[PDB]
Amino acid sequence: MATSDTQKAMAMLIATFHKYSGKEGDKLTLSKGELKELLSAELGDIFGKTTDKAALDKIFKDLDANADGSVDFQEYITLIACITMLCNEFFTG
Amino acid sequence: ATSDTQKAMAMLIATFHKYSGKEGDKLTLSKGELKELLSAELGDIFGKTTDKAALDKIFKDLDANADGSVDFQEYITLIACITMLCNEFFTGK
């Protein structure tokens, strides 16, 4: 029932988040380990395009602090967008 | 082909550029342009908001600073905000 490009894209991002968050527990958050697996499965084949290796490495490092904490949808979206801005030709040129 | 996460981000980039590729820097969107984008792309889910005041605040801020600009991160944060106020996955409605 998504009726615009933005709604279709958001539905895809929710569905991917839920594929990892929906196995058990609270569906509204990912564990740090669930998030690491998602990012590698969904974005791993563009990491090599990064314009800032240190910044991308820092992302996978910060997901080892608060190891027992959670990642909500806003934090997830922000990280996907950060990786996209480091790796996608629209922003890298 | 690419993952659904990459497909979704490519769609969000294309929509951002459709409104940002008219004037100035393609990497920023005026807040007045963003208002038009959000209304066209998400307007038909605004009746589902759990927090009308929160939705109204977004638009009040866009009207007050229509000539200011947002980057891609600020754009996707606002889309995620509205999605979390209106989409059943979050609202339970």
Short mmCIF file of C-alpha atoms in Angstrom, two decimals:
data_model
loop_
_atom_site.label_atom_id
_atom_site.label_comp_id
_atom_site.label_asym_id
_atom_site.label_seq_id
_atom_site.Cartn_x
_atom_site.Cartn_y
_atom_site.Cartn_z
CA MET A 1 0.00 0.00 0.00
CA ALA A 2 3.00 2.32 -0.51
CA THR A 3 1.98 5.00 -3.02
CA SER A 4 5.17 6.97 -3.73
CA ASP A 5 8.85 6.27 -4.30
CA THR A 6 9.62 7.45 -0.77
CA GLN A 7 6.98 5.17 0.80
CA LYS A 8 8.25 2.21 -1.26
CA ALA A 9 11.84 2.86 -0.22
CA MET A 10 10.88 3.24 3.44
CA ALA A 11 8.87 0.02 3.31
CA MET A 12 11.95 -1.79 1.97
CA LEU A 13 14.09 -0.35 4.76
CA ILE A 14 11.54 -1.32 7.43
CA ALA A 15 11.24 -4.83 5.99
CA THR A 16 15.01 -5.28 6.02
CA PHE A 17 15.25 -4.00 9.60
CA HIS A 18 12.47 -6.40 10.62
CA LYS A 19 14.09 -9.35 8.90
CA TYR A 20 16.80 -9.01 11.55
CA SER A 21 14.73 -7.64 14.45
CA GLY A 22 11.68 -9.88 14.03
CA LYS A 23 13.16 -13.25 14.97
CA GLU A 24 12.50 -12.68 18.66
CA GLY A 25 12.30 -9.97 21.22
CA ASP A 26 11.41 -6.40 20.50
CA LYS A 27 10.96 -5.77 16.77
CA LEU A 28 11.59 -2.03 17.14
CA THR A 29 15.29 -2.40 17.89
CA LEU A 30 18.31 -4.29 16.65
CA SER A 31 21.07 -5.60 18.80
CA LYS A 32 24.55 -4.44 17.93
CA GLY A 33 25.32 -7.88 16.51
CA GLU A 34 22.13 -7.97 14.44
CA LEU A 35 23.01 -4.55 13.01
CA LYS A 36 26.54 -5.62 12.10
CA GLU A 37 25.20 -8.62 10.18
CA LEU A 38 22.59 -6.51 8.36
CA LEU A 39 25.14 -3.91 7.25
CA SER A 40 27.55 -6.50 5.87
CA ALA A 41 24.80 -8.45 4.08
CA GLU A 42 23.07 -5.35 2.70
CA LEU A 43 25.94 -2.91 2.07
CA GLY A 44 29.16 -4.92 2.23
CA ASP A 45 29.69 -4.90 -1.54
CA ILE A 46 30.05 -1.08 -1.60
CA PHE A 47 32.34 -0.55 1.43
CA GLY A 48 35.35 -0.55 -0.94
CA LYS A 49 34.00 2.59 -2.62
CA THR A 50 34.33 4.66 0.56
CA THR A 51 35.89 8.10 0.28
CA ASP A 52 36.86 7.98 3.99
CA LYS A 53 38.20 4.62 5.13
CA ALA A 54 38.76 5.87 8.68
CA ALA A 55 35.18 7.12 8.98
CA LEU A 56 33.73 3.84 7.75
CA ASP A 57 36.07 1.90 10.06
CA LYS A 58 34.96 4.09 12.96
CA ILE A 59 31.35 3.05 12.31
CA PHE A 60 32.13 -0.64 12.76
CA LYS A 61 34.20 0.29 15.83
CA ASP A 62 31.48 2.33 17.57
CA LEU A 63 29.20 -0.72 17.26
CA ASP A 64 31.43 -2.38 19.85
CA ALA A 65 30.71 0.21 22.54
CA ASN A 66 27.35 -0.23 24.27
CA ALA A 67 27.56 -3.83 23.11
CA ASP A 68 24.50 -4.70 25.22
CA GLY A 69 22.53 -1.71 23.94
CA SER A 70 20.08 -1.37 21.12
CA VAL A 71 19.68 0.40 17.80
CA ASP A 72 16.31 1.91 16.90
CA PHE A 73 15.09 2.67 13.40
CA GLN A 74 16.31 6.26 13.42
CA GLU A 75 19.82 5.25 14.39
CA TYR A 76 19.77 2.49 11.74
CA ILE A 77 18.59 4.89 8.98
CA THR A 78 21.25 7.42 9.93
CA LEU A 79 24.01 4.77 9.67
CA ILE A 80 22.77 3.50 6.31
CA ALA A 81 22.66 7.08 5.03
CA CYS A 82 26.17 7.78 6.38
CA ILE A 83 27.56 4.72 4.60
CA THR A 84 25.66 5.66 1.43
CA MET A 85 27.14 9.17 1.52
CA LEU A 86 30.67 7.76 1.83
CA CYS A 87 30.21 5.11 -0.87
CA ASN A 88 27.62 6.24 -3.48
CA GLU A 89 28.65 8.05 -6.67
CA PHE A 90 26.04 10.77 -6.12
CA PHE A 91 28.11 12.06 -3.19
CA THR A 92 31.62 10.80 -4.07
CA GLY A 93 31.46 11.99 -7.68
CA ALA B 1 21.37 -7.16 -8.73
CA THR B 2 21.79 -5.05 -5.59
CA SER B 3 20.18 -5.51 -2.20
CA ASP B 4 16.83 -3.98 -1.32
CA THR B 5 18.68 -1.59 1.02
CA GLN B 6 20.75 -0.28 -1.88
CA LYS B 7 17.65 -0.09 -4.08
CA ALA B 8 15.82 1.91 -1.39
CA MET B 9 18.71 4.34 -0.92
CA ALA B 10 18.97 4.85 -4.69
CA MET B 11 15.27 5.75 -4.75
CA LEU B 12 15.68 8.20 -1.86
CA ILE B 13 18.69 9.78 -3.63
CA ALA B 14 16.73 10.11 -6.90
CA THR B 15 13.78 11.81 -5.17
CA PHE B 16 16.15 14.12 -3.27
CA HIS B 17 17.84 15.10 -6.54
CA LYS B 18 14.51 15.65 -8.34
CA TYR B 19 13.84 18.50 -5.93
CA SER B 20 17.52 19.54 -5.39
CA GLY B 21 18.70 19.40 -9.01
CA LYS B 22 16.66 22.44 -10.00
CA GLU B 23 18.91 25.09 -8.41
CA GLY B 24 22.25 25.51 -6.64
CA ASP B 25 24.10 22.62 -5.06
CA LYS B 26 22.66 19.20 -5.86
CA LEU B 27 23.74 18.05 -2.39
CA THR B 28 21.32 20.36 -0.59
CA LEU B 29 17.62 21.03 -0.66
CA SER B 30 15.94 24.24 0.39
CA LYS B 31 13.48 23.73 3.22
CA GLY B 32 10.70 25.08 1.00
CA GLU B 33 11.54 22.44 -1.60
CA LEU B 34 11.66 19.83 1.16
CA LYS B 35 8.17 20.85 2.27
CA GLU B 36 6.89 20.23 -1.27
CA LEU B 37 8.67 16.87 -1.41
CA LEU B 38 7.31 15.67 1.93
CA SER B 39 3.76 16.76 1.11
CA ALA B 40 3.81 15.04 -2.30
CA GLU B 41 5.65 11.89 -1.23
CA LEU B 42 4.18 11.36 2.26
CA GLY B 43 1.05 13.52 2.38
CA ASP B 44 -1.33 10.62 1.91
CA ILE B 45 -0.14 9.00 5.17
CA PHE B 46 -0.32 12.14 7.33
CA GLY B 47 -3.86 11.18 8.49
CA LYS B 48 -2.32 8.19 10.27
CA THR B 49 -0.03 10.21 12.57
CA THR B 50 0.06 9.30 16.26
CA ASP B 51 1.23 12.83 17.07
CA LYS B 52 -0.39 15.62 15.07
CA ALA B 53 1.57 18.24 17.01
CA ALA B 54 4.84 16.57 16.04
CA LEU B 55 3.83 16.52 12.38
CA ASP B 56 2.76 20.16 12.58
CA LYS B 57 6.08 21.18 14.16
CA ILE B 58 8.00 19.81 11.17
CA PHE B 59 5.96 21.96 8.79
CA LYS B 60 6.04 25.05 11.04
CA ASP B 61 9.85 24.82 11.01
CA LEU B 62 9.99 24.37 7.23
CA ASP B 63 7.76 27.44 6.73
CA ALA B 64 9.76 29.62 9.10
CA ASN B 65 13.11 28.86 7.39
CA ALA B 66 11.99 28.06 3.83
CA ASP B 67 15.18 29.57 2.36
CA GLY B 68 17.49 27.54 4.59
CA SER B 69 18.84 24.26 3.40
CA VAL B 70 19.14 20.62 4.44
CA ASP B 71 21.60 17.93 3.45
CA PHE B 72 20.81 14.30 2.66
CA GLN B 73 21.20 13.17 6.28
CA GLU B 74 18.73 15.81 7.54
CA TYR B 75 16.32 14.85 4.74
CA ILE B 76 16.35 11.14 5.51
CA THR B 77 16.00 11.83 9.26
CA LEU B 78 12.80 13.80 8.64
CA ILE B 79 11.42 11.13 6.31
CA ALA B 80 12.18 8.53 8.98
CA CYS B 81 10.54 10.71 11.63
CA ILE B 82 7.29 11.01 9.66
CA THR B 83 7.40 7.30 8.80
CA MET B 84 7.72 6.43 12.50
CA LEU B 85 4.72 8.65 13.29
CA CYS B 86 2.50 7.26 10.53
CA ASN B 87 3.47 3.70 9.56
CA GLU B 88 1.69 0.77 11.24
CA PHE B 89 5.00 -0.99 12.03
CA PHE B 90 5.62 1.77 14.59
CA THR B 91 2.16 3.04 15.44
CA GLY B 92 0.48 -0.33 15.87
CA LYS B 93 -2.60 1.18 14.25
#
